[PDB]
Design a protein around this ligand. Structure first.
Ligand SMILES: O=c1ccn([C@@H]2O[C@H](COP(=O)(O)OP(=O)(O)OP(=O)(O)O)[C@@H](O)[C@H]2O)c(=O)[nH]1
Ligand SMILES: O=c1ccn([C@@H]2O[C@H](COP(=O)(O)OP(=O)(O)OP(=O)(O)O)[C@@H](O)[C@H]2O)c(=O)[nH]1
Ligand SMILES: O=c1ccn([C@@H]2O[C@H](COP(=O)(O)OP(=O)(O)OP(=O)(O)O)[C@@H](O)[C@H]2O)c(=O)[nH]1
Ligand SMILES: O=c1ccn([C@@H]2O[C@H](COP(=O)(O)OP(=O)(O)OP(=O)(O)O)[C@@H](O)[C@H]2O)c(=O)[nH]1
Lengths: 212, 212, 212, 212
């Protein structure tokens, strides 16, 4: 696996878990539940990248524990309607965490990125940012969204891109443009299909999470 | 660490997380939230012990994925009122999982274990059992509860004891009596205090989770 | 309906909702989900009994709203293992609310109530107390638990007993002994069976929520 | 209150609850928690509008209960990024419910509504639709979204618009255009401000829920 691509440990349990959401017979309730469990694993892996400092912790009864304090401020940012699914996993790990939104698409007439919606913390330049997109297929949207974050002052080495599954094409595209962004993914699949879906993939993540 | 004691990886993030719940200044809302996050980490580690089989998974679009199917049926069993806190973490990982209850105490007059309450799945003898007790201090209650499970036909090597923190005294006592039970813990602390609390510990887990 | 018995409004939706959990074909996942939704309705009805004071609320932009502030401190107390199910509904309505536990049974030899476990807020005498027991059949356990609360200084008119279903026998027994305790219930059924289950009822609430 | 405007009962508890989220001193954690509790109240009120049929329910032990079955299929549809907050409340009441998305804005050049994103159930024409937008200020977005639903075959009298707060201006605009859509709201405030925020309102719902 390439530099700055962090793959969840491919345990027997993780493969069994991914097998549930991949299986085309898995219905929406189970698809949502188990996707949410995977999303929490991605968030935990991404949080393992953040810095800490040693700290003495006072425990009840007058005892001291040699512990640690978190040094990173965090927020999540979702980018397509499908990334919204990931917000709950993030908020189950990071209490009341801030979550922003970037909705950005190539302008059909000028072929340049164009922003449809933005909501970000006012101090986002001082934060680590978990970019939330469940499927890294081509990486088109995620690359446009990172450019917005960088324009808003976010440090390149404080952006972590969480996704359930990635294709090699998207990893390559994204890393060619943003080689210091860490990609946290739960699986790297084979290729894309002609509609740019990941293969073997899991069908349409957003449709399965929300509608079908 | 001894045989059949499985310690969560002691990452910077995990130490920072434990430091929140240990800190005597952490109030109930934060104590509950972050304990719940730790409990989910314990459940995920325990689930990594369960068996799988390879399985071809059919994915949308006619693709096949070489995946896996879970082979273990599971349930959780909590044992003191404090273990009840752990039920939500288990049910966030294992959809609608069965959860039993064993309330058992030494008879003050005969000094022999006496059962106050029991509710277990009718097929518990065919299941893996996550025994839920947040603090492994002396291990007294957990040992009595395991004896009940074994009397009900549960296989010794299908019992996994999840706890947030353990003392050496409790690990030794428990493993001397049930050496094939796996203990999944998030930290092993120094010793016990004269009221049999873990040191440095985190005060009274149940009081902090529920009442104070 | 008698004095101090507060019945949830028997809307078409509520009957449809109760019909899901009553139906013997409803499996555990659906039974848990819909019971939890009902439990939240019971908590909301019970919270409607608590006092408020008028208060001017400052809203963003320099506006004032004639609002209100809650005057009651609250906690929940569950009493049989089955009441534990209700804790999550209470904590989805009252953020990080304190929850106590009373486990009390008649002494088989002396026929007098005997306490197996107690954990209550140190200031419980100053709180409203939601007593949590899903089924008010005979009311035996709930009556013993109320006596403990009153011994601990809880005001009689600050105890609210939440239950999903009640039998007339239990309402009568409980109200004969504690006529100033409000009973909040979602349905009053016909009678008890010879094993003291409510009829037509919903089978064994605890078994269905947890084990079967 | 006008025809087809359904106001949550303005209980002491509801006013106390709204006072928490209105208060400009309420921080994000409390704002999210209590908004979510209100959103569930809106969903329950909206569900009370849906049809049922009488049904005999078989209960354990051979008993029959004269109950009811739901006749409406449902989905939610959110419309601005702020409506996404409401999805969790809906999914806590309606198990695994389908949720769609309509992102639609007036074309700046042609002044005609233009669709940026749509994801709806394939059978949405057969469903009741909970339109989710936390603040009914001008109603501009909600009116454009309803037109999309009607174009997709949704029945006018199966659309229910859930919002936490409404201004008279938005109620009037929306009802002038769609008089058979039911509006379920938790409060009707005084007027709009020059940036079209509700007064006295609660500031910027989306900013407070997510970012600030
Ligand atoms: O590495 C980390 C960093 C942070 N966190 C957790 O993420 C949560 C958000 O951590 P933040 O430090 O970003 O808080 P915030 O700025 O949004 O908070 P306020 O100003 O609104 O008070 C915090 O509870 C923290 O413990 C982790 O879990 N791991
Ligand atoms: O290793 C495992 C095993 C099981 N599980 C998950 O635990 C859940 C419970 O798995 P069980 O296999 O114990 O289901 P059950 O017997 O209680 O189910 P019913 O008979 O009521 O239908 C299942 O959704 C499974 O996917 C894991 O997550 N990991
Ligand atoms: O009528 C009420 C009263 C209280 N509540 C809600 O119940 C929650 C608990 O309200 P409490 O007032 O009991 O708080 P507490 O004493 O346990 O809090 P700390 O001392 O630990 O700080 C509070 O967030 C309150 O808003 C209601 O929702 N309705
Ligand atoms: O009035 C109602 C109607 C429905 N509901 C609840 O909303 C949930 C969704 O009810 P639906 O009937 O819309 O289910 P669905 O079509 O999406 O289900 P599948 O085809 O995927 O199997 C169901 O569990 C129902 O009980 C209510 O709570 N109240």
């Amino acid at each position: 696996v390439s530099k700055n691509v962090i793959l969840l440990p491919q345990t027997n349990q993780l493969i069994g878990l991914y097998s549930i959401i991949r299986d085309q017979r898995t219905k929406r309730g189970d698809f949502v539940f188990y996707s949410d469990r995977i999303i929490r694993l991605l968030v935990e892996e991404g949080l393992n990248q953040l810095p800490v400092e040693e700290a003495i912790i006072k425990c009840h009864g007058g005892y001291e524990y040699k512990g640690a304090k978190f040094l990173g401020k965090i927020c999540g940012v979702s980018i397509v309607r499908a990334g919204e699914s990931m917000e709950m996993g993030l908020r189950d790990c990071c209490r009341s965490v801030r979550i922003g939104k970037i909705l950005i698409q190539r302008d059909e007439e000028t072929a340049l990125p164009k922003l449809f919606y933005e909501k970000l913390p006012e101090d986002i330049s001082e934060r680590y940012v978990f970019l939330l997109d469940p499927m890294l297929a081509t990486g088109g949207s995620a690359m446009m969204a990172v450019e917005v974050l960088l324009a808003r002052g976010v440090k390149m080495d404080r952006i972590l891109f969480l996704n359930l599954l990635a294709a090699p094409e998207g990893i390559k595209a994204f890393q060619d443009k943003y080689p210091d962004v860490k990609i946290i993914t739960g699986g790297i699949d084979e290729k894309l299909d002609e509609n740019k879906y990941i293969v073997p993939g899991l069908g349409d993540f957003g449709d399965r999470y929300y509608c079908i």
